[PDB]
Symmetry: C3
Subunit: 255 residues, 3 copies
């Protein structure tokens, strides 16, 4: 427990200006304004439409591997998924020489698409698939994820060997690999500021990385439309703002 | 592997008398005599009545959030849940200046109700709920958990923001947060005796905390109606007694 | 990321000849030639026949404890399960004084049956069961696992106390215990070579043990019919061979 003081976007800017190695921790909050639904119970959740028991678990995948591809296929095709100002904001913060890494739980690859250089994907990424028998990795893209694509024509997509392609994202019942977790630890260890942007709703890999940050005495700044699990627990400051309002911050540090 | 020697309640008393910083690790065994059912396959289990696949998992909650509230509501209302002698025993052991902390896996808050001061709740606690969209925390009590209460009138209970209240307890598919685990580690690290009371049936957070205790060369005493996973593995002594027979021990150290 | 160079069986032999403390990490790949099906989506998988949601999870066990015993009973009875050359190969490598431990994820106990001495069973073992109320451990064998055995006559098998026997293997929703994980760490820590044989298909306990191995700068050799998750990530060399082709290696080092 500790005191988390609310500050303003312009106050945050003043904090960042002094720092030299900023890391951003990002969850579904950073993608909401790109029309990507969340994956918990946040009202804007994907689980309105699909049963998580069947569509989101490894044992659900083992028995009905097509279903998670229906999910991915539908989202890619039916929603106007594009970069938002927050992503442009972050990208320019990296261009300005302050933001060094982004550890994300998002599977949409938007940070990278924004022009950030070092993106650690805790929950994997929807643009890789892996054959479940021969381990062939195939890198995908928007076009191959479309409902009319050849790749999507027969579900589940099949490897040349005859095996079944699994999307390279963490499902319910899978743990994040140790080495990926360490890459995230290693980046936080050497940071002088941590932005927890649009995440920490609930205990998760991200919460634990925030705890790690406290243990390492790192200044934490929370940017979120609401309070969260780490507020008055591990975060030092809180900025109540939507992700896209970060352009307010990028503009100031540009001048 | 090692030798776990069975001792008597009065032998245990002689051990405690010499110690200065006792920590108790407690599971469902400490609540059984308060008519709280267990949550495994121990015959007195809650899963006779409810399907764990639907009533006890986060993905089960995401799709049917009312169900776990039916569970909590029914238990609170239909069983005579009260403190037992074991809880009074522990409370007086803390009053006598020997017992410093209790790490529990129980979600019933009985230890606290007993008058213990430092209770670390590994699996959360049934007297807090959290809005799944705005993260508002609401502290509950017996009265609000009753089937006739306003809080329980519409399920799932709704936050003012319009969001859905989730009970603050660990479900199947959720991991215990790192910081909560550390608070438990930190307490064991500085203890000179560990009482594993009414738990360790199976590999669990509690088993791992016992392993941690061995690694830190701490004297472990098991109190349980039967042998368990840590017996002749990590525990140094075993007292075959029901939780409520601890008053035999408290009475002796009182004089 | 790093370079994994493919080598030959005879090249591997030349590597082993120089080492003094070899540890083998083994998964379902080592048992495939004994007709034991895998437990993922590898085409030869057990989940063709059974629903993992009901037959393979702890919550599935709590509600329908007979089902996993049907699984074990059917496999034991209907498949010609015997040691293969790879197991004989490993056993002789331990006889030749090179191979010191085997950390396995397999639940079939074949390594031990091969005549290896130190087998650490990450996912438990199908030849122990434990009463879910009194924790009585019963050691089983082939004969007791047969469909006509007394043990298998009434499912789930019942403990004398009246409780229900649970097979001593890790199910979906259970974590590997810390102390078992440490025994595996401790063995790798002091090894000078690690053979990842027939495993590492996907992120798992085994992958994490490979990561641990890198962190400890240990030479890793992969033996598998295909590439895997650790290839060009953590493994130093790769031998593309079936498990049973290890006799080629054992024969050379025998002379
Ligand atoms: N546009 C947004 N900007 C910032 N945070 C958001 C936005 N939309 C949702 N959130 C937050 O993102 C978090 C999502 O957490 P999680 O679903 O656990 O990754 C919640 O705490 C939301 O309050
Ligand atoms: N009245 C009691 N006193 C002490 N131990 C108990 C009592 N009732 C059940 N137990 C034990 O509590 C443990 C429950 O373990 P778990 O369900 O894993 O928390 C089992 O090992 C039981 O033998
Ligand atoms: N006969 C065999 N010899 C060696 N590796 C095998 C054999 N059969 C299957 N495999 C491999 O074993 C691994 C199984 O991984 P997992 O199912 O994750 O334990 C896969 O990478 C397969 O390519
Ligand atoms: Zn393939
Ligand atoms: Zn709310
Ligand atoms: Zn029994």
């Amino acid at each position: 427990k500790k005191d988390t003081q609310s500050i303003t976007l312009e106050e945050l800017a003043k904090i960042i200006k002094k720092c030299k190695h900023v890391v951003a921790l990002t969850g579904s909050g950073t993608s909401a304004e790109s029309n990507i639904p969340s994956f918990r119970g946040s009202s804007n959740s994907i689980w309105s439409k699909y049963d998580p028991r069947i569509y989101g678990t490894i044992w659900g995948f083992w028995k009905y591997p097509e279903k998670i591809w229906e999910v991915i296929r539908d989202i890619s095709s039916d929603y106007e998924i594009e970069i938002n100002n927050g992503h442009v904001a972050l990208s320019t913060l990296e261009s300005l020489g302050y933001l060094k890494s982004v550890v994300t739980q998002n599977v949409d690859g938007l940070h990278e698409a924004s022009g950030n250089t070092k993106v650690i994907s805790l929950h994997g990424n929807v643009f890789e698939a892996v054959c479940c028998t021969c381990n062939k990795i195939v890198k995908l893209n928007k076009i191959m994820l479309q409902k009319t694509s050849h790749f999507m024509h027969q579900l589940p997509p099949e490897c040349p060997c005859g095996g079944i392609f699994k999307p390279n994202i963490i499902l319910f019942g899978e743990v994040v690999s140790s080495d990926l977790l360490k890459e995230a630890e290693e980046e936080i260890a050497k940071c002088d500021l941590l932005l927890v942007i649009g995440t920490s709703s609930t205990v998760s890999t991200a919460t634990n990385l925030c705890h790690f940050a406290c243990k390492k005495k790192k200044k934490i700044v929370e940017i979120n439309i609401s309070k969260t699990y780490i507020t008055n627990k591990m975060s030092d400051y809180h900025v109540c703002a939507k992700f896209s309002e970060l352009t307010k911050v990028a503009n100031i540090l540009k001048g």
